[PDB]
Design a protein around this ligand. Structure first.
Ligand SMILES: [Mg+2]
Length: 712
DNA sequence: AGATTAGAGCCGTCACGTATCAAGT
DNA sequence: TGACGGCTCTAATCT
DNA sequence: CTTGATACGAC
């Protein structure tokens, strides 16, 4: 059974050893203005580490670790307290604080020992994470690593920009070239100073996972995290009862459902007219409208589906795609047109769709045509235009037709609740929208306003709000309710879907192992390689050309130079015909990875019984053991296609908790939601994270906001 | 009064191929 | 107003 | 003997 690994950390600190070799102490800046002393005081000190605890009931602010305690002075506005490790519980401290305090001493360099650290946050950076930013203004983006109270390891990106003087008030950070991390600066020191906050229009991003090679892997979030964890394990082995490793977990109700081809939605729009018109006459949308109309005509996909694409002058019945100028707050006339009666309108803007940079007077937009026939109808953007058009038709007609009888009959007995926390109207207020399906698959939208102060009402809309209200940690801000996605109701059974910051983390240990096996340079010796292949020859069994390819590989290394890089051998195999795409090479390729000192290609992309890239694909359900007895259920959404060599983002964990119906809730509804979450018309070419009726609800609420500005 | 968490706003993301099971004269 | 989620931010919050 | 329309793969 597969095993996903979340962010949660599993570890045990060697408590006595931590007490034996270090003397911790806590500092509570009593008065606001006091910080300033604490700083000068901290500058004259040399603590092993510093961390912030932010105890609920005060109980100190900064916990700091030394080897030998300096003579503690007494100053007003703050107070210091030498602590014993058993009182660690007393002051509202938790083992995550000790783990963070120990982690602050590590660095990203391989085989890095412990070092003193005055900065209460691990901020890992590199020389390759720096842009010039026009004229002499340095800028570095770093990966802050922090262990929170829930034992989650949050990784964030923080941008630092150069300043030309030692500035008080705001914190001052300096880059340590050798260690690679950013250190807080307490006194004016030689070097260059940085402050938090980007001052450019380039949002720095770090790829979540890189699989191209080891060098690119170590430049990703997973690579840096794995390096830090390995350094911590090899440096704190005396201080750790159990090594710091990511949580294991089992996966249940896995759904390897295959998304249908995106051209299926094109078939749905069959036999109807699709008008295209522009906002008055701006010479920009007018021209873009003509180009869009002509391309669809020659696509030959609409001709198969008998789609009438007509370039009209103004509003027409049926499907109508229009072109506007994205005026909004541009201090001009807004050409956006509101659909009325049976008209269905989907709007597109020249700036976004045509990538119209302020410049050339003619639109250079061109659909991405590929796959033998160069038909623009396969363009991702144009496909999504039809995808929304079908949804808006369903909303107008009030009938479900997109998901085929099958899925529709599966979603018939379930009802969905969507919560929209109102911005204005002082008193806290959320909009509860309930969607119901008739046996004839007709949409029934109903909403009831509820006040967050008085939930004593017995009506259904109030009761569901009361159930969610207790579940949420701080139901006072927007983001508390924005985290809530929907509430699936099966009559007397309810289930809540909530977002979380917990994410899937692939096995960093295995990724490092295979990538090191496939290191591009990986200097070898001819004798050892020949012997290595020789001993494993009896274990290759035989699959016809499989052994012949293996024997061909053995002969290839025989005639080569005694010391060669792996790239030269890899290049030689390409001439030999052992392309890493045919059945013969792949079996040789996979066999080498399991037991050898080199491999032509890793097995990371390909699926395996126990693949290290687990949880990044398909839909699965897991039961993370958070609190003793209180099992928590989560579901993750990956990607149906094979993952690209580089993965930019990660997979978050949505949370399912039974609002009513004990534990039988999750086992029954999840297979229903599994088929709900396998539709490609919400997220193009990808699994929808939430059930698709949530999409339907969002558009209906958006339509309400158009004529109800007070709800915005 | 610095820490933070909020709350909003943005970049990224959605292809050719060898394998093949059955579509046959 | 391709639009969808992560998530990086900045400002707002709560000190 | 022959090819046509789905899959794990790269990359
Ligand atoms: Mg829209």
């Amino acid at each position: 059974q597969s095993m996903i690994r979340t962010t949660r950390l599993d570890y045990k600190i060697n408590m006595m050893q931590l007490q034996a070799d270090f003397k911790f102490l806590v500092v509570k800046i009593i008065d606001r203005s006091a910080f300033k002393d604490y700083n000068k005081l901290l500058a004259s000190w040399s603590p092993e580490a510093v961390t912030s605890i932010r105890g609920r009931y005060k109980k100190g602010d900064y916990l700091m670790m030394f080897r030998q305690l300096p003579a503690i002075p007494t100053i007003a506005g703050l107070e210091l307290h030498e602590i014993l490790l058993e009182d660690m519980g007393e002051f509202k401290i938790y083992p995550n604080h000790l783990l963070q305090l120990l982690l602050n001493q590590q660095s990203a360099n391989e085989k890095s020992l412990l070092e003193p650290c005055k900065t209460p946050e691990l901020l890992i950076s590199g020389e390759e994470w720096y842009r010039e930013f026009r004229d002499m203004r340095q800028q570095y983006y770093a990966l802050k690593l922090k262990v929170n109270w829930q034992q989650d390891l949050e990784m964030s990106v923080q941008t630092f920009t150069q300043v030309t003087e030692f500035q008080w008030d705001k914190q001052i950070y300096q880059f340590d070239e050798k260690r690679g991390r950013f250190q807080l600066c307490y006194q004016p020191s030689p070097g260059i100073y940085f402050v938090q906050g980007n001052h450019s229009a380039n949002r720095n991003y770090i790829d979540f996972l890189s699989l191209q090679n080891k060098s690119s892997f170590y430049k990703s979030k997973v690579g840096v995290v794995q390096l830090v964890l390995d350094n911590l394990n090899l440096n704190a082995e005396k201080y750790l009862l159990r090594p710091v490793t990511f949580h294991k977990s089992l996966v249940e109700h896995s759904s390897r459902l295959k998304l249908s081809k995106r051209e299926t939605i094109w078939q749905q729009l069959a036999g109807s007219s699709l008008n295209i018109y522009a906002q008055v006459n701006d010479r920009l949308s007018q021209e873009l409208a003509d180009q869009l109309a002509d391309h669809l005509i020659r696509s030959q996909l609409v001709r198969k589906n008998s789609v009438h694409v007509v370039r009209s002058q103004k509003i027409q019945s049926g499907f109508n795609i229009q072109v506007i100028r994205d005026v909004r707050g541009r201090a001009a006339e807004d050409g956006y047109e509101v659909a009325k009666n049976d008209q269905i309108v989907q709007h597109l803007t020249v700036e976004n769709f045509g990538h119209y940079q302020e410049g050339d007077k003619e639109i250079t937009w061109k659909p991405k045509v590929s796959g033998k026939h160069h038909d623009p109808a396969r363009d991702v953007a144009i496909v999504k235009l039809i995808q929304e058009l079908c949804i808006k038709r369903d909303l107008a007609n009030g009938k479900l037709k997109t998901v085929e009888p099958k899925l529709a009959s599966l979603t018939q007995p379930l009802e969905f609740y969507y919560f929209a926390f109102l911005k204005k109207s002082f008193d806290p207020e959320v909009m509860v929208i309930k969607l119901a399906f008739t046996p004839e698959m007709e949409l029934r939208f109903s909403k009831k306003k509820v006040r967050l102060n008085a939930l004593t009402s017995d009506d259904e809309y109030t009761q569901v709000c009361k159930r969610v209200f207790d579940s949420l940690a701080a139901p006072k801000f927007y983001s508390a309710w924005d985290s809530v996605d929907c509430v699936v109701r099966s009559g007397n059974k309810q289930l809540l879907i909530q977002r979380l910051n917990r994410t899937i983390m692939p096995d960093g240990k295995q990724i490092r192992k295979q990538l090191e096996l496939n290191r591009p340079d990986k200097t070898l010796w001819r004798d050892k390689v020949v012997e290595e292949l020789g001993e494993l020859r009896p274990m290759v069994s035989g699959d016809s050309d499989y052994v012949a390819a293996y024997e061909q590989l053995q002969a290839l290394v025989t005639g080569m130079r005694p010391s060669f890089p792996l790239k030269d051998l890899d290049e030689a195999a390409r001439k030999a015909g052992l392309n890493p795409k045919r059945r013969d090479m792949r079996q040789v390729n996979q066999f080498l990875t399991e037991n050898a000192t080199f491999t032509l290609k890793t097995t990371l992309q390909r699926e395996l019984p126990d693949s290290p890239l687990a949880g990044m694909k398909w839909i699965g359900l897991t039961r993370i053991e958070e609190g003793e007895g209180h099992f928590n259920t989560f579901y993750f959404v990956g990607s149906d296609k094979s993952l690209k060599p580089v993965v930019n983002r990660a997979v978050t964990l949505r949370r399912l908790l039974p609002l009513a119906g004990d534990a039988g809730i999750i086992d029954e509804l999840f297979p229903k939601l599994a088929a709900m979450m396998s539709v490609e018309f919400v997220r193009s070419g990808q699994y929808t994270v939430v059930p698709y009726p949530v999409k339907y609800l969002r558009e209906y609420w958006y339509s309400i906001l158009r004529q109800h500005p007070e709800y915005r």
